Design a binder for this molecule. Structure first.
Ligand SMILES: *[C@@H]1O[C@H](CO)[C@@H](O[C@@H]2O[C@H](CO)[C@@H](O[C@@H]3O[C@H](CO[C@H]4O[C@H](CO)[C@@H](O)[C@H](O)[C@@H]4O)[C@@H](O)[C@H](O[C@H]4O[C@H](CO)[C@@H](O)[C@H](O)[C@@H]4O)[C@@H]3O)[C@H](O)[C@H]2NC(C)=O)[C@H](O)[C@H]1NC(C)=O
Ligand SMILES: *[C@@H]1O[C@H](CO)[C@@H](O[C@@H]2O[C@H](CO)[C@@H](O)[C@H](O)[C@H]2NC(C)=O)[C@H](O)[C@H]1NC(C)=O
Ligand SMILES: *[C@@H]1O[C@H](CO)[C@@H](O[C@@H]2O[C@H](CO)[C@@H](O)[C@H](O)[C@H]2NC(C)=O)[C@H](O)[C@H]1NC(C)=O
Ligand SMILES: *[C@@H]1O[C@H](CO[C@@H]2O[C@@H](C)[C@@H](O)[C@@H](O)[C@@H]2O)[C@@H](O)[C@H](O)[C@H]1NC(C)=O
Ligand code: NAG
Ligand code: NAG
Ligand code: ZN
Ligand code: ZN
Ligand code: ZN
Ligand code: ZN
Length: 382
């Protein structure tokens, strides 16, 4: 018979499938994504932040800030005040000072008395302002999706449960790089990701969380097809001895050596039609990228689908991202299901800087100063 159920605090689980381009939903049958759509909300065009790389965009999701403000401007950075480098590829990400120009939402959540949990979310196993999420996993890409889900569900159902979870998975980004997003093999990995989403849905239902957790499924960026016929080779124009390459492609962050600034700029600007060379102060305002000492004196941006190689042996991948965030192929999926969200609703656009204000609203937190607007996304809510 129908009876009372104890009022639960509002809960949110944010899931990021890395590199899940907005239109991947249509490359193969995605019944579990479509199940969420039919019972939830879906935004066609999510404008993420420049540069359209993993660490800048995940930190935007948990701060509501543009990259010049939260300071995670790239996956590879050099901070001249710290005189230190940051590099994802070397797992050299744990220097707290690279993160401390902002405060991620899990800290704000916990300062309000709640508990947060993170299962491989970029930056969640880093000490920031002397704090971690209440529960987190040390980053390890080899941990299965099923084990990450198991931890999330354990934490949402613990003696002292979390109200806010973050779950992360490295596909379809990794395969998109390997084969290129135009490859028919992308169907296999997208289908697998849809199966993993179905596994998550099944476990949320089994744990009696499905109808009381607001599940948000999104990503950090998309992916575009590259080609060995679309390469810009810097050593055709520049003496490698006269600059340091802080980040390579498709946004080359260039630090000329002492006195070589005008040599480097003059040699590279207009050298190739698909490489736009900006002096820091000329960087487009719409990217909200330039007001930060981690933005190097010269930033050279390749057009969509072009690769910057410093020399003939530099890295090349059939898929890449990082390009202009106005480009549709850089845009991630966004869909959601839960008691706070409408059902079978589709909206054309959102800015990824708005998610932070949505999360703060759902959890009844006081948002720190940010660049998004709850009013832009209030129509997703029931
Ligand atoms: C990498 O960099 C290259 C080189 O800069 C860019 O290529 C240019 O792209 C633009 C935009 O499409 C081209 O301009 C358009 O050309 C069309 C005709 O193309 C043929 O003829 C020209 C010679 O005039 C050749 O260069 C070209 O290869 C083709 O053979 C025109 O129809 C277009 O005019 C129409 O659209 C424009 C708006 O785009 C309107 O203003 C017009 O009124 C008209 O309606 C336009 O002129 C340009 O020709 C290309 N240059 C070259 C050398 O190919 C790439 O776009 C860039 N790559 C990426 C991914 O950004
Ligand atoms: C994404 O953010 C931009 C920038 O804030 C929004 O563009 C502004 O929209 C307001 C209306 O609320 C206009 O008054 C401003 O002139 C716009 N500013 C700029 C710089 O264009 C945009 O609406 C947001 N998009 C979504 C889908 O939320
Ligand atoms: C994005 O949001 C941040 C936070 O509100 C803004 O940063 C502030 O900018 C003012 C100048 O208007 C400075 O006085 C503050 O010191 C900044 N605060 C922080 C925390 O950095 C930023 O201006 C916003 N960006 C845009 C493009 O609107
Ligand atoms: C700056 O620091 C150097 C040692 O640190 C390494 O190099 C810097 C540039 C960063 O890449 C950092 O992450 C590395 O661990 C010193 O060798 C160098 O002398 C220092 N320079 C000055 C001027 O103090
Ligand atoms: C990551 O997880 C795997 C599987 O349990 C384990 O073999 C490995 O030692 C872990 N640590 C790292 C740094 O990969
Ligand atoms: C390219 O640059 C690397 C440094 O990253 C250097 O070790 C390598 O020998 C260079 N290769 C060519 C072909 O110039
Ligand atoms: Zn990514
Ligand atoms: Zn990637
Ligand atoms: Zn990987
Ligand atoms: Zn690979």
């Amino acid at each position: 018979h129908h009876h009372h159920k104890l009022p639960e605090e509002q809960k949110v689980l944010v899931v990021s499938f890395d590199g899940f381009r907005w239109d991947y939903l249509y490359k193969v049958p995605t019944p579990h994504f479509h199940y969420i759509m039919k019972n939830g909300v879906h935004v066609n065009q999510v404008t993420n932040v420049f540069i359209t790389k993993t660490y800048p965009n995940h930190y935007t999701l948990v701060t509501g800030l543009f990259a010049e403000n939260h300071g995670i401007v790239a996956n590879d950075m050099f901070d001249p005040i710290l005189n230190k480098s940051f590099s994802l590829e070397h797992m050299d990400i744990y220097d707290s000072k690279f993160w401390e120009e902002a405060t991620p939402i899990w800290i704000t959540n916990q300062r309000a008395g709640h508990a947060s949990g993170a299962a491989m979310w970029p930056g969640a196993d880093v000490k920031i302002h002397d704090s971690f999420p209440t529960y987190y996993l040390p980053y390890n890409e080899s941990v299965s999706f099923e084990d990450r889900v198991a931890k999330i569900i354990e934490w949402f159902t613990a003696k002292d449960p979390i109200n806010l979870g973050f779950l992360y998975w490295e596909e379809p980004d990794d395969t998109g790089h390997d084969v290129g997003p135009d490859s028919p093999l992308m169907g296999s990995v997208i289908s697998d990701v849809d199966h993993k989403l179905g596994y998550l849905i099944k476990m949320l239902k089994r744990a009696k969380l499905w109808n009381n957790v607001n599940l948000i499924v999104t990503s950090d960026h998309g992916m575009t097809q590259c080609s060995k016929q679309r390469v810009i080779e810097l050593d055709r124009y520049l003496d490698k001895e006269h600059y340091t390459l802080i980040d390579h492609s498709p946004v080359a962050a260039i630090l000329p050596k002492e006195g070589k600034f005008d040599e480097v700029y003059d040699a590279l600007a207009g050298a190739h039609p698909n490489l736009t060379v900006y002096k820091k102060e000329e960087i487009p305002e719409r990217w909200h990228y330039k007001h930060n000492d981690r933005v190097q004196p010269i930033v050279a941006v390749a057009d969509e689908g072009w690769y910057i190689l410093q020399n003939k042996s530099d890295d090349f991948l059939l898929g890449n991202h990082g390009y202009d965030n106005a480009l549709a192929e850089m845009h991630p999926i966004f869909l959601a299901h839960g008691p706070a969200f409408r059902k079978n609703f589709t909206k054309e656009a959102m800015n990824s800087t708005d998610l932070y204000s949505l999360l703060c609203h759902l959890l009844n937190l006081t948002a720190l100063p940010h660049n998004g607007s709850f009013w832009n996304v209030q129509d997703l809510l029931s």
